Design a protein around this ligand. Structure first.
Ligand SMILES: N[C@@H](Cc1ccc(CC(F)(F)F)cc1)C(=O)O
Length: 308
């Protein structure tokens, strides 16, 4: 099913009935926005993989390099942000994405864009804007006015003209709930889960420095994975298991020494999860398998980012 391919590994689709209608049409487009990021990590790639799914299913793909948004979220000066955006777009092309790339600031300063922001600032409460940003806003002991403008710009109808589907992480869902209420035409949201960071502390993050970057060296992936929170028998909160779920190909053959049980062949992640949960498979053989298949999945991307 095209539908079930798109739905595989998302946390929610709002809504499924509207997505079946979109899939019927001959012309459909899907958008995702990203604040430019100094490092692109597996959190980014999970979402790019969803966009490749939509692209296989017939959708035109639009990537918004959300530079002004990064600007409001205190990531720096704009033309410095627009140069990080340029690099991120190289990375997304090396992931195998066939898309159109738009810089926010190329249209977000237009008079009609600006008037919608003022119009929406009239319908949106300070309390709701702030709630909507709890998972997104840069850490700040004295919150700035910029924090409450960010979500109203994210739900501006100009971002969604001729767009059927928006894709984002679950950390964006309150902002999308706002847009569901306030947008003139309905857009389907597809939310992808948030990856746990390597120490299990919170969520994977370019500023928490708890991530694996797609351009990481092999030795580097090994060392991050070796150090990673992965309690025996525990799946919930375990970032090594998450990587197994969202990134690996099954059936999976796990090489191990014959004293640890010999080569193991798992035909599904659900099979891996039962093996792991009852301790027929130890963190260390998991880790070696995950590290080794992660290296092979990332290699072509590291290669073209390094080509020259
Ligand atoms: N909040 C996102 C960035 C963002 C996501 C979505 C949009 C609207 C749209 F998706 F681009 F159309 C604008 C910016 C993030 O946290 O990177």
């Amino acid at each position: 099913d095209e539908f079930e391919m798109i739905k595989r590994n998302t946390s929610e689709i709002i809504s499924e009935e509207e997505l079946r209608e979109v899939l019927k049409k001959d012309e459909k487009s899907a958008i995702i926005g990203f604040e430019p990021s100094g490092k692109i990590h597996l959190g980014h790639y999970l979402q790019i993989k969803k966009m490749i799914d939509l692209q296989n299913a017939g959708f035109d793909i639009i990537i918004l390099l959300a530079d002004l948004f990064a600007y409001l979220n205190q990531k720096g000066e704009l033309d410095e942000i627009r140069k990080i955006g340029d690099y991120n777009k190289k990375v997304f092309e090396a992931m195998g994405l066939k898309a159109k790339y738009v810089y926010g600031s190329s249209f977000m300063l237009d008079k009609d864009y600006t008037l919608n922001v003022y119009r929406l600032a009239l319908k949106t409460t300070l309390k709701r804007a702030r709630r909507s940003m709890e998972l997104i806003a840069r850490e700040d002991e004295n919150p700035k006015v910029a924090e409450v403008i960010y979500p109203i710009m994210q739900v501006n109808p100009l971002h969604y003209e001729g767009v059927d589907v928006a894709v984002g992480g679950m950390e964006q869902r309150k902002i999308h709930m706002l847009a569901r209420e306030l947008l003139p035409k309905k857009v389907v949201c597809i939310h992808n889960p948030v990856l746990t960071g390597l120490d299990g502390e919170g969520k994977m993050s370019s500023s928490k420095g708890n991530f694996i970057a797609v351009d990481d060296s092999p030795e580097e992936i090994r060392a991050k994975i070796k150090k990673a929170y992965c309690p025996a028998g525990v799946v919930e909160g375990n970032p090594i298991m998450e990587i197994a779920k969202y990134f690996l190909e099954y059936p999976l053959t796990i090489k191990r020494p014959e004293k640890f049980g010999g080569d193991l062949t798992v035909n599904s992640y659900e099979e891996l999860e039962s093996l792991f949960k009852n301790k027929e498979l130890h963190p260390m053989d998991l880790k070696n398998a995950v590290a080794e298949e992660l290296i092979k999945i990332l290699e072509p991307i590291r290669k073209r980012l390094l080509e020259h």
